[PDB]
Motif scaffolding. Sequence first.
Motif, PDB file in Angstrom:
ATOM      1  N   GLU A  29       0.915  -1.360   0.179  1.00  0.00           N
ATOM      2  CA  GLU A  29      -0.022   0.101  -0.093  1.00  0.00           C
ATOM      3  C   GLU A  29       0.730   1.298   0.179  1.00  0.00           C
ATOM      4  N   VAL A  47      -0.225   4.449   2.068  1.00  0.00           N
ATOM      5  CA  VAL A  47      -1.063   5.329   2.812  1.00  0.00           C
ATOM      6  C   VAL A  47      -0.434   6.564   3.571  1.00  0.00           C
ATOM      7  N   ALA A  67      -8.625   8.692   4.098  1.00  0.00           N
ATOM      8  CA  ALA A  67      -8.406   7.773   3.071  1.00  0.00           C
ATOM      9  C   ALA A  67      -7.948   8.307   1.725  1.00  0.00           C
TER      10      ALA A  67
END
Lengths: 76, 48
Positions: free
Chosen positions: A14, A16, A22
Amino acid sequence: WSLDMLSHPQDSMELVHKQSKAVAVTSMSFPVGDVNNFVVGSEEGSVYTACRHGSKAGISEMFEGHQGPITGIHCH
Amino acid sequence: ACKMSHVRDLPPVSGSIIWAKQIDRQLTAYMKRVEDVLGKGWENHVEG
């Protein structure tokens, strides 16, 4: 993924951010010539410029110049 | 081969299951060849 292994991920991870926001990609583009320098547009601008190889995952750096979602970009 | 097993006087059911297990033997040998070619990637390979 590979050419045939649709069960075993080749490189799945990922990208993030630190806080709980989000991360919404917006017309993100692959690095031009696979230089690993890919860009990720977002809704409040938020150009997520990051690298791929090594331990350069997550969010490398960003820059905003507007608040609209970049629905068109071209790494050249 | 059924009648051949009968000429050998043994019941052909035994020769039949020997024959079927022989098929299984070369089948496993072919699986080995699949492992000679793909190794283990054949579980997800298209032809594999």
